[PDB]
Amino acid sequence: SKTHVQLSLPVLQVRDVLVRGFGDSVEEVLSEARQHLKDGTCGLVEVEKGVLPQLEQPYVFIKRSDARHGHVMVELVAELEGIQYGRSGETLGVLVPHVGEIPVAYRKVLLRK
């Protein structure tokens, strides 16, 4: 019922990811990402060169939403064909479904719902 929720997200290496995106439209990927976040079945891939071309568009990014418990404040921004829906701060990673892959870290976030 809150505007923000504390979550700990598993950080996945891109080559381990089994389900490489959330859906087929900007609205769908945002909707599905929010549902997986709520259900604790959302992973995070940190963006490096070569990562994004190995995932499926539209992308869902988590981006830093301000500057000021390790739960960095973030919001969701989708991208399709180089157009972004939402404007925010720096990217912490790209969200993907988590289906039991072994992570390399956990990232604590305070997610704006």
Author numbering: 9 to 76, 80 to 124
What does the paper say about this structure?
Nonstructural protein 1 (Nsp1) of severe acute respiratory syndrome coronaviruses (SARS-CoVs) is an important pathogenic factor that inhibits host protein translation by means of its C terminus. Nonstructural protein 1 (Nsp1) of CoVs is regarded as a major virulence factor. On one hand, it binds to the host 40S ribosomal subunit and blocks protein translation. Recently, the cryo-electron microscopy (cryo-EM) structure of a complex containing the 40S ribosomal subunit and SARS-CoV-2 Nsp1 revealed that two C-terminal alpha helices, consisting of amino acid residues 154 to 160 and amino acid residues 166 to 179, bind to the mRNA entry tunnel in the ribosomal subunit.
